[PDB]
Design a protein around this ligand. Structure first.
Ligand SMILES: CCCCCCCCCCCCCCCCCC(=O)O[C@@H](COC(=O)CCCCCCCCCCCCCCC)COP(=O)(O)OC[C@H](O)CO
Ligand SMILES: CCCCCCCCCCCCCCCCCC(=O)O[C@@H](COC(=O)CCCCCCCCCCCCCCC)COP(=O)(O)OC[C@H](O)CO
Ligand SMILES: CCCCCCCCCCCCCCCCCC(=O)O[C@@H](COC(=O)CCCCCCCCCCCCCCC)COP(=O)(O)OC[C@H](O)CO
Ligand SMILES: CCCCCCCCCCCCCCCCCC(=O)O[C@@H](COC(=O)CCCCCCCCCCCCCCC)COP(=O)(O)OC[C@H](O)CO
Ligand SMILES: CCCCCCCCCCCCCCCCCC(=O)O[C@@H](COC(=O)CCCCCCCCCCCCCCC)COP(=O)(O)OC[C@H](O)CO
Ligand SMILES: CCCCCCCCCCCCCCCCCC(=O)O[C@@H](COC(=O)CCCCCCCCCCCCCCC)COP(=O)(O)OC[C@H](O)CO
Lengths: 799, 799
């Protein structure tokens, strides 16, 4: 899907550029500049105002999603999440940080579930998508003659299509209303409908209406931004209709911003009626005001909140996995786009005139080329930053400063230099955000990032051809080094960019194959055992089975056991070591999974590392609850119903003649354990002789055994393998672990772990007999929240 | 001394500037520029060649010092140390990194003693100083008429003075040769002479001659650099004589480079004969070629070797305390000098012409002023860098980039911008060098750094008056903001620099008084005890006496006990904690001592932290040797004479009826210990109840006791207080500690410490009875290696 989807995305973008070139044949870059200058200042204020209104409506859009999801959030939190997610989501789309990814980060702080947020994201997306046909139909149905003239279709055709769409919408609403199950309601404003296979959660009448009203105002507001920037305008009904179709085409095309496809359609519709230059100027200004501007504001806002959190919560925040790294990857990517577009466009004659006296003329040429190559590097380094490489931070920050310098030496492009400098100043402030000391050469290949780069380089060549259309091409142009010669500087830059991008991409893709997964050897198992001993986490013991691969840190003070099953790679627990070692290992695991084209899964993780799993792009699903008794507050002279039942079980066990014995590793009765294991029925001598075995006996004869996970420290201890005979008494097993607890209390252990119960009722009650302290265990899995998949699933179930 | 010495240094510099202004009254900056352009290219090559020769001679200068000191070093090491020490030493003098400080750092790697290096430094300095009169006298004695005409003195006078100097030199040589003690010789090429009070170590005849020959060639070579840059020249004899006197005056004046005083004298001598412009051009070029150039090369060389060491030895080097921080403080200081001098000088008319079209004219004025203020900040921040503040690194690196930018916006000063950028590029590479996270606001006041800044600002105002002498001053000049107006830009900058420097210096000096030293409270003692437990070093126990101040780290994972005695502050051991915590604490201690105007002394330090003591500017003196027995190789079934004597002592002790008992803290027989303490004669119950006491008894009655320093780990354990009765057997004490060793071997301790012997023979033998492993303990003390002090001491002893 990914490769095909990316290829058909690039083709659509490419075709759209070709379309836009042909539609702007009769216009020169002069006419465009005049058209941009022409639009009056009241109109720009009108646009900016309409933009502000149009983004206020999206906050109410976010509110409706919270009501649907049944999520209570503060107003300031919904505001920030609403703005940032819609601002970034609309701009970059899927390429970099998406709407869902923003929502999840933001709304995980307040303890909103991963399921809830996913349900908020889907509602936010689908509601526009499914309203767009209805809104379009209604728009066309007012003044059909104008709508017909705009689309250049028969009046009868567009009439029946509009009617058909409305009728189908009504028919659908009536159908899903038919299967409305009464009684139960997930949230105040929701329904649960049944179709046979799956239950489906839909909004209520009141919420459906409100959402449609919000969607209506939002579209109108957005279209209004473009309507005000047009000197001469068509009837609004037809204009709105076209805008909605163009918007649809942009969405379906899966082009990040909707760029190219949106413009192409608008241009196509109103090529002749309005004129190219006014429309092309309006479309450009529309993009800047409604798309780019709120993105920058959102980016800044999120950086501001990150910076603030670092200032106030200095102690709490340690490793730093927040918003800075994604956001700064965007800004650095945009910085590369600026450099590349600046190069394609010719310089101002006045600046070159004077700068010719300050600089050698042949250095202007050198500066111009180098700036364009730095531009390409900026596009690719955006990935490195996203993965929190410190090498990527240092290298970027150098290139941005050099790129800002060569921007001034090029054609005194002080606007390009100012943006690049400002990006550098931001990237500098967040040095600690990029903490990984991995090589840049070992970053896994990302088709998306390469695809995005190719699009930008494509767009720049489109801009080269447009901006330098006054000159007659020739074979000699490439070798002209003059000052007035602007077109040769474009050409040479364009070629340089394309060749570098090609070279790097080939150098990236044609790389040595990654080593195959192998079970650990004796040395590694011994080294793992060492780490487990000099650590807190005893659950690490399962590593020493030697049936699952071990991934070691560079310092070799931490590891992370995992195993490949099907098309996924499941880690068994959190990494084993300090917080920083944990963070580097989690990123190492993501890297390893990306090199093997496998889905990174984490099994049974604690809540403390959830932000790091968020960072690499996983969602915490509530797997089960792990119970662990506290030995500090546990005492055998206390009172309680369950406590009295336990003391009864204990004393009855002692009177019966049950005895408990502890054997250190090496001196275990292997013959007995084997016989017991066989009677019950991994169990290997190598695995067993790593741990201390507690054997309970009934009148001398061994009645059960249990190996004990334990570290050199006394913070925690657990039990993995534990088997009892069928013929053994029922209270013997309960006596055993009670004896274990007593022994650990004598040794002076802080805590003791029993185990995890998923979602079992008998096991849950049995654990609850000891009155333990519960703690949630999570499962981390990738965020598969594609709107199209969900809509296709809905449509399939309905049909 | 320091305040008086610094004041009389500044006055001499000031007076010298006034002198140089008056001597260059009849010359305009135009005539100087022409004179600088006039000197031919063969002459410059002649100068550069003479410089290269003149610095090759200084390597042989270094060699002679090694022979005198009796130091064997590799040729490459002597070369580097020779070059770097003489290059930096001659340039910056005493202000920043000095010759001795360079030598000590460089020659500490090869395990050369602190005493030896000090003796190498003194010889390197004094040999020139004491040869300079002789060389001068001899020079004058060739062609007395020319020498008389140069000095404008009578021929008879200069004759008798020269004779008197030579006669006195011969008389001195004969006198010290008289008291030449035969037999003993510290080194092959040295003598030991006696005058009654102190023994004095002098070079041999052969070494004295060779040193004088080396000194002769060196001076000649240096003078030759200046001689070739003169179009029209006087007789060389007289020229050399003057050069030597000017050099003397420069040295005596204690002006860092000899700048001002040297030029003043040369100018004074050959004002009329040669002409101002040729001489003033030659003096400037001489400074650049012979002084500034080798400094930069030395700086680069030392940075290169640091960078290489970081690349190859990544694992070994951890905290980074080498050459980068001093060297980069110099380069950043020079960068501030460049900014300040650039501002004082008027801009090129051609550049302003064109840059006027690219920039707003009023921004040129703003850029010009801001650049000069950044210049002043660069001078002061040089200190912060020296003390390895990370805040200072970040702030500098920002100001250098802004300063390099405003250099281009000022008058397109691309030379200033290029230097500043290159400094930034270096400073960036060594980010990890500045590792301390202390506040910039808490840096102690340094009169020297403030004095240096005032000199630079003084020099800039001298340059302002010289460079802008064509304009007529008026009260209105200050308020003129034009493009052609260069002199007002100088004035406004000059005033701004002076006011900022004044303001900061006053804000620095008038600061709150530092809190007084107080003994620790119960909480601190308890917190110290905690640290000691969770650590390796048991010698930290002496902190819990509570009679000495405790300095805690910000993390509170490490501390450093110290006490004030007289005018010094003695730390008792190395800091207690990790390597990074140790390095931050040592710097904290330096800071604390500088705020209280006290000499930082470290008592009984290990060899592992010697580089960090080097960093803050202390010299390791061999205090004593600490013996510590290794329990891994120690066994009671081994063979050996001393081992058999120990086993005899043990078994005889057991047969006699000596018994050893171990009491945990709290359950000590206080009544007994008190009685034993009184019988022997800090001893307080609070101090005693922190440690485990081992009490040996003779037939039941307690015969001795000894508290045991110990941590939670088993890496090391010691004993501090240990008293025995006069009437107790002689082998009872030896049995006691043998029992202690056996007990620690049973507990499974890695090592065990006995104690330190200074320089005692009986104690040394007693420790050697157990066949321990010796390890040197050092004393860290400031480096008081002032040539004048040593010469005054020598002169006093001779007389
Ligand atoms: C780092 C330093 C980069 C080079 C700085 C400028 C070179 C010195 C000035 C000079 O002579 O530049 C020449 C520039 O000559 C060149 O060949 C320029 C290309 C070399 C620089 C390439 C990197 C520049 C961008 C970074 C101009 O001579 P011309 O070719 O106009 O003479 C006819
Ligand atoms: C009309 C002319 C206008 C001139 C411009 C005037 C205004 C300039 C304002 C510039 C301020 C922005 C720079 C602030 C960066 C934050 C500093 C920082 O944190 O730097 C980090 C990175 O280190 C740096 O030094 C980065 C330097 C790069 C800054 C680049 C931005 C400035 C760009 C200036 C123009 C450059 C030229 C462009 C044109 C060619 C170090 O972080 P740390 O956590 O390791 O250290 C913190 C310390 O311990 C204290 O707590
Ligand atoms: C034309 C619209 C209709 C058809 C669209 C379909 C075809 C798509 C392909 C082309 C789309 C973009 C074309 C127009 C973009 C702007 C062109 C432009 O002016 O580019 C300048 C440079 O490129 C841009 O400005 C690019 C703008 C788009 C991206 C901006 C992102 C902003 C964020 C950057 C990172 C900074 C982050 C810090 C800020 C918080 C260079 O031209 P100049 O002559 O104006 O500049 C010279 C001199 O400096 C001043 O005159
Ligand atoms: C950070 C940004 C610093 C300022 C960037 C330049 C300002 C915009 C351009 C402008 O209009 O500059 C004016 C500059 O006006 C000023 O007052 C300049 C002083 C403000 C800048 C001070 C800091 C600059 C150096 C850092 C020129 O107008 P005029 O005073 O020549 O008109 C008569
Ligand atoms: C004719 C035009 C000529 C144009 C110039 C072309 C040549 C430019 C060459 C510049 C290269 C020098 C910069 C190298 C600096 C070392 C990088 C570095 O380590 O930076 C540290 C500081 O961080 C930075 O990003 C510093 C950036 C500042 C660099 C300043 C020098 C460049 C100056 C360019 C011109 C600026 C404009 C001047 C004029 C206004 C980060 O160290 P770290 O240990 O934290 O990270 C290492 C990582 O883990 C990988 O191992
Ligand atoms: C005059 C000699 C006899 C009398 C001496 C007694 C009086 C002492 C006080 C004055 C001493 C210095 C006077 C002359 C210094 C140089 C003047 C000069 O040219 O200054 C320029 C700037 O100042 C300097 O260059 C100062 C030079 C001295 C210090 C240099 C240190 C180098 C290291 C700096 C740090 C960089 C580190 C990285 C490099 C490895 C600005 O003038 P400009 O017109 O040449 O420049 C404009 C344009 O850019 C090009 O024309």
């Amino acid at each position: 899907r990914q490769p095909i989807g990316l290829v058909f995305t690039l083709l659509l973008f490419g075709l759209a550029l070709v379309a836009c070139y042909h539609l702007l044949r009769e216009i020169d870059p002069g006419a465009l500049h005049d058209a941009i200058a022409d639009v009056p200042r009241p109109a720009l204020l009108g646009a900016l105002s309409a933009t502000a209104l149009g983004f206020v409506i999206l906050l109410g859009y976010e509110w409706s999603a919270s009501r649907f999801a049944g999520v209570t959030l503060p107003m300031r939190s919904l505001a920030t999440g609403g703005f940032s997610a819609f601002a970034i989501g609309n701009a970059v789309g899927l390429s970099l940080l998406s709407g869902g990814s923003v929502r999840y980060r933001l709304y995980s702080r307040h303890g909103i579930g991963a399921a809830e947020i996913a349900r908020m994201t889907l509602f936010a997306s689908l509601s526009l998508g499914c309203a767009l046909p209805v809104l379009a139909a209604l728009a066309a149905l007012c003044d059909l003659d104008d709508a017909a003239s705009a689309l250049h279709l028969p009046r009868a055709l567009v009439a029946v299509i509009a009617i058909a769409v409305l009728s189908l919408a009504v028919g659908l609403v009536a159908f899903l209303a038919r299967h409305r199950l009464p009684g139960e309601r997930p949230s105040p404003d929701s329904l649960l409908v049944r179709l046979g296979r799956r239950s489906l959660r839909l909004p209520g009448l009141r919420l459906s209406l409100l959402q449609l009203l919000i969607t209506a105002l939002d579209v109108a507001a957005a279209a209004t931004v473009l309507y005000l920037l047009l000197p001469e305008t068509p009837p609004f009904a037809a204009f709105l209709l076209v805008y909605l179709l163009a918007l649809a085409a942009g969405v379906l095309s899966h082009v990040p911003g909707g760029v190219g496809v949106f413009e192409a359609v608008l241009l196509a519709a109103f090529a002749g009626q309005l004129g190219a230059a006014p429309l092309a100027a309006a479309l450009l200004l529309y993009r800047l005001i409604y798309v780019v501007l709120p993105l920058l504001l959102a980016c800044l806002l999120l950086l501001f909140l990150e910076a603030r959190r670092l200032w106030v919560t200095r102690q709490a925040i340690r490793v730093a996995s927040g918003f800075a790294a994604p956001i700064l990857a965007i800004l650095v990517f945009l910085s590369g786009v600026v450099l590349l577009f600046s190069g394609a466009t010719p310089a101002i004659d006045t600046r070159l005139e004077h700068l010719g006296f300050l600089i050698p003329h042949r250095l202007i040429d050198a500066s111009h080329l180098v700036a364009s190559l730095i531009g390409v590097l900026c596009l690719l380094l955006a990935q490195g930053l996203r993965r929190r490489l410190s090498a990527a931070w240092a290298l970027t920050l150098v290139l941005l400063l050099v790129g800002a310098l060569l921007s001034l030496l090029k054609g005194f492009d002080w606007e390009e230099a100012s943006l690049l400098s400002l990006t550098a100043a931001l990237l500098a402030m967040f040095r600690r955000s990029f903490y990984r000391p991995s090589r840049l050469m070992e970053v896994p290949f990302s088709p998306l990032y390469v695809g995005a780069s190719i699009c930008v380089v494509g767009a720049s060549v489109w801009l080269l051809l447009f901006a330098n259309q006054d000159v007659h091409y020739s074979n000699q142009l490439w070798w002209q080094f003059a000052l007035d010669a602007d077109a040769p500087r474009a050409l040479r830059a364009a070629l340089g960019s394309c060749l570098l991008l090609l070279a790097l991409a080939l150098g990236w893709l044609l790389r040595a194959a990654p080593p195959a997964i192998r079970e650990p050897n004796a040395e590694e198992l011994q080294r793992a055992a060492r780490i487990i001993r000099h650590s807190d986490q005893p659950d690490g013991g399962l590593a020493l089975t030697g049936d699952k691969a071990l991934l070691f840190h560079e310092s070799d003070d931490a590891f992370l056991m995992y195993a490949r099953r099907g098309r996924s790679m499941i880690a068994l627990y959190d990494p084993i070591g300090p917080a920083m070692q944990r963070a580097e290992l989690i990123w190492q695991f993501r890297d390893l999974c990306d090199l093997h084209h496998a889905r990174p899964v984490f099994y049974q993780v604690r809540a403390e590392n959830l932000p790091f799993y968020m960072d690499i792009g996983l969602t915490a699903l509530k797997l089960g609850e792990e119970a662990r008794v506290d030995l500090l507050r546990f005492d055998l002279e206390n009172k309680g119903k369950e406590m009295k039942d336990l003391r009864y079980t204990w004393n009855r066990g002692q009177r019966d003649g049950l005895a408990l014995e502890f054997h250190e590793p090496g001196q275990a009765p292997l013959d007995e354990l084997k016989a017991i294991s066989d009677a019950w029925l991994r169990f290997t001598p190598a695995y067993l002789n790593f741990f201390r075995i507690a054997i309970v006996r009934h009148q001398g004869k061994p009645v059960a055994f249990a190996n004990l996970l334990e570290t050199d420290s006394r913070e925690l201890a657990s039990l993995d393998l534990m088997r009892v005979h069928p013929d053994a008494p029922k209270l013997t097993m309960e006596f055993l672990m009670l004896g274990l607890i007593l022994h650990y209390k004598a040794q002076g252990h802080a805590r003791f772990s029993l185990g995890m119960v998923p979602l079992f009722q008998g096991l849950r009650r049995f654990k609850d007999k000891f009155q333990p302290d519960w703690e949630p265990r999570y499962l981390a899995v990738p965020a598969g929240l594609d709107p199209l998949v969900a809509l296709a699933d809905t449509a399939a179930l309905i049909a």
